[PDB]
């Protein structure tokens, strides 16, 4: 009965808790202390891509590591050109209310997301030289925080109701729900290999689901606040998680638990976005206190800030050769730098 | 010059820098609200009393003014984390019940709570809130009866309706800290066309002072 | 669909003046670039004028600009030109075209129909010369092509601007590949572009019977823009 289910719930909740305790032999840092640190990091601002007129809430790069697309609440999602600081498209949105973006691995397609529960497909080979929607996905019953794409035929959503969905887009359908939360979520991250994938929950916890069966693997929950971003190692083995409780984590998928934690006393503030470099050493994080923070991904050490922003920023991303990265705040700016 | 064929790419970036700035310049001039309230607070009848899932953009005008009233409440999830995308909003519309002689907690005491969390919230100590008292018969017929005692202890005074409101009103409006922002009352109850013309009233004094407040005159 | 067609043809007093109107239809007129390119009975192809998007830049050739204008009315998704005081040397069909320009556009993608104009009788730019007009093959085989140009075509860019073209006998001609390496749309994965410079090749591999036709090569560096003489390809 409810007894019998109270105390299986206890003991495994026990047994995995002891398995975590005794699988724990040291720090990371003991096996690290032997790395050279990499030192003051100055970054300079390359572009200034001033063409929005409201506040940004997502970007994305493209394949080539060029192109680039930007989304905010002015109406407008716009292609820019990064090396060139040129604009190449400008698409005008039904709902202006956008918290999300993505850009097709094949640059054909691109997705926005929103506050009206529907993820609309955009078209950009045209015959007829205009960008126009294709299909439209409504089934979810909250507002989606994240769309990352899988091929040019299916794309993965997230919503604000404590699932998660696969939706094929060549019939329009929904193919494969996911459900195990308890709060919203509001980031994930497609894996390199296009086989599993991460999202961060609301009620402070993230859980590694498989595009394959449908199933969670694994769940990490050692961590004390809502989660706002999550991107992966390049390796396709760890990931890190953006809370708003001034602190972001490393988990591990292997080991099963929390490798590194990366604060200060003076920062009080939250995380909004994570990436990392193409070597997997650099971590960059966006704060609420109006600028970016360079980490250092392996000593946890503050080395370095990407001071320049007016307000705060919102969305982060790296280009694929670890060549340039791209910032937006809450100003209608965004920013590119070496 | 040493751009060839490029020529023709930076006149598409100039006609489309164009054309956003004329799009912004003419999606500039429609003054934006926000509609709050809580369980049966009337603020259907509001909404419906307009004559031209997810949010009900409601738009309509009034004295070649183009409104847009972001009916938001069909949202069913932790509230804190979208309302940011609802700054830079004109003024907020709040609606609130005057039956409050009943339980969900007390319901005034659940009103009360809800107005001092969204009144103090960081992003809107400079965005005015407008005040709707609905239901102004239902609460006049029904203090005949019972006292306005049976829901506020410290309360004192008479059992009459003028003094009633005038005291719900206060508890209500003295709740904001700040001294930028102002609260506007008013009381309705599916009464005539009266409860669109007391919004523009009070989006014209919110312009005026926005005004003032840019120009550096304030 | 993409429709292109042209009236306004046929036969004119030497010294007169007559329209031409190239009517478009089943695409966003308003945000392309029209040209016009005439073709001699027997000649190649000749480069006449532009006008890009909004109207904003126009070119002229160098035995036109003075006579000729050129006009579009996107609203009515129609082109003009105005040709006053005709030669008989101006004895040639009209053509149009699609000049999309962005980043990653592919210019020329499509070819109007060519309206017919007959009149009865009474050194700094770049210039594009091609091996032989006449060229035999045989079905089953890979045949290749030239067409050296006089101006290297290599911008600081990084990018090279030579266009390949394609007629068969009696249509209008095609586009194969744009900017020396990339393969357009619709035309097969057969056809390849190469070169470097100033020396360029098109490779065809497996070769059918319905790639017979006349090939064209085209620089895209400045205005004007300049052809080549052809090479002919006939069966056996």
């Known amino acids: 009965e409810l007894d019998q289910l109270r105390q299986e719930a206890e003991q495994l909740k026990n047994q995995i808790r002891d398995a975590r305790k005794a699988c724990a032999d040291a720090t990371l840092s003991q096996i690290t202390n032997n790395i050279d640190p990499v030192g003051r990091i100055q970054m300079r601002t390359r572009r200034t891509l001033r063409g929005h007129l409201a506040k940004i809430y997502a970007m994305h790069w493209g394949t080539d590591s060029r192109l680039l697309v930007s989304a905010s609440q002015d109406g407008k999602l716009i292609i820019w050109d990064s090396y060139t600081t040129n604009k190449v498209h400008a698409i005008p949105l039904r709902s202006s209310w956008v918290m999300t973006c993505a850009y097709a691995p094949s640059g054909n397609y691109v997705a926005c997301g929103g506050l009206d529960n529907i993820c609309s497909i955009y078209n950009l080979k045209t015959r007829e030289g205009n960008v126009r929607v294709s299909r439209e996905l409504a089934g979810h019953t909250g507002y989606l925080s994240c769309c990352r794409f899988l091929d040019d035929n299916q794309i993965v959503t997230s919503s604000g109701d404590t699932t998660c969905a696969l939706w094929d887009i060549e019939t329009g359908q929904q193919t494969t729900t996911f459900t195990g939360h308890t709060g919203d979520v509001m980031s994930l991250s497609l894996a390199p290999d296009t086989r599993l994938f991460v999202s961060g929950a609301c009620d402070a916890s993230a859980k590694l689901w498989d595009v394959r069966e449908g199933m969670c693997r694994q769940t990490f929950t050692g961590h004390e606040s809502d989660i706002n971003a999550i991107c992966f190692f390049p390796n396709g083995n760890a990931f890190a998680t953006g809370s708003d409780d001034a602190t972001c984590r490393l988990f591990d998928l292997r080991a099963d638990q929390e490798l590194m934690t990366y604060s200060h006393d003076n920062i009080i503030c939250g995380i909004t976005s994570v990436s990392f470099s193409k070597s997997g050493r650099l971590l960059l994080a966006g704060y609420d206190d109006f600028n970016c923070n360079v980490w250092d991904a392996l000593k946890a050490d503050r080395a370095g800030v990407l001071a320049g922003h007016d307000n705060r920023v919102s969305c982060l991303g790296v280009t694929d050769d670890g060549m340039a990265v791209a910032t937006g705040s809450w100003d209608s700016f965004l920013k590119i730098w070496n | 010059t040493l751009s060839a064929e490029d020529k023709a790419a930076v006149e598409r970036s100039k006609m489309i820098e164009k054309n956003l700035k004329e799009d912004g310049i003419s999606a500039a001039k429609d003054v934006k609200l926000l509609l709050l309230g809580a369980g049966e607070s009337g603020k259907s009848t509001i909404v419906k009393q307009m004559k031209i899932t997810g949010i009900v953009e409601t738009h309509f005008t009034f004295k070649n003014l183009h409104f847009r009233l972001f009916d938001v409440g069909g949202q069913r999830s932790e509230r804190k984390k979208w309302i940011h995308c609802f700054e830079d909003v004109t003024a907020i519309i709040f609606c609130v019940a005057l039956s409050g002689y009943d339980q969900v907690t007390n319901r005034m005491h659940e009103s009360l709570m809800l107005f001092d969390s969204i009144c103090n919230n960081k992003f809107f100590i400079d965005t005015s809130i407008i005040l709707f008292l609905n239901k102004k018969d239902l609460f006049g017929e029904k203090i005949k009866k019972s006292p306005l005692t049976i829901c506020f202890p410290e309360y004192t005074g008479p059992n009459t309706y003028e003094d009633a409101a005038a005291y719900i009103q206060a508890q209500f409006e003295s709740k904001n800290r700040s001294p930028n922002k102002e609260i506007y009352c008013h009381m309705t109850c599916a009464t005539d066309t009266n409860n669109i013309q007391v919004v523009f009233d009070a989006v014209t004094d919110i312009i005026i002072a926005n005004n003032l407040r840019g120009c550096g005159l304030y | 669909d993409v429709q292109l067609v042209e009236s306004g043809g046929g036969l004119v007093q030497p010294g007169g003046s007559r329209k031409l109107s190239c009517s478009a239809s089943?695409?966003?007129?308003?945000?392309?670039?029209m040209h016009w390119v005439r073709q001699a009975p027997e000649k190649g192809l000749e480069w006449v004028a532009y006008?890009?998007?909004?109207?904003?830049?126009?070119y002229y050739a160098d035995t036109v600009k003075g006579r000729f204008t050129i006009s579009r009315d996107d609203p009515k998704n129609t082109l003009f030109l105005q040709m006053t005081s005709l030669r008989s040397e101006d004895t040639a069909m009209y053509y149009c075209?699609?000049?999309?320009?962005?980043?990653?556009?592919?210019?020329?993608?499509?070819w109007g129909q060519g309206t017919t104009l007959t009149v009865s009788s009474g050194g700094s730019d770049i210039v594009m010369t091609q091996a032989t007009s006449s060229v035999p093959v045989t079905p089953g085989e890979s045949v290749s092509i030239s067409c050296r140009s006089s101006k290297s075509l290599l911008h600081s860019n990084g990018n090279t601007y030579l266009y390949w073209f394609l007629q068969r006998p009696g249509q209008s001609p095609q586009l194969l590949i744009y900017?020396?390496?990339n393969l357009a749309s619709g035309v097969p994965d057969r056809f390849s572009g190469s070169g470097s410079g100033t020396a360029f090749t098109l490779t065809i591999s497996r070769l059918e019977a319905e790639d017979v036709g006349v090939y064209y090569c085209m620089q895209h560096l400045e205005y004007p823009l300049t052809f080549g003489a052809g090479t002919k390809l006939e069966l056996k």
């Open positions: 900017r020396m390496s």
């Open positions: 089943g695409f966003a007129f308003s945000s392309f670039g």
């Open positions: 075209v699609r000049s999309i320009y962005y980043y990653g556009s592919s210019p020329f993608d499509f």
């Open positions: 006008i890009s998007s909004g109207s904003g830049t126009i």
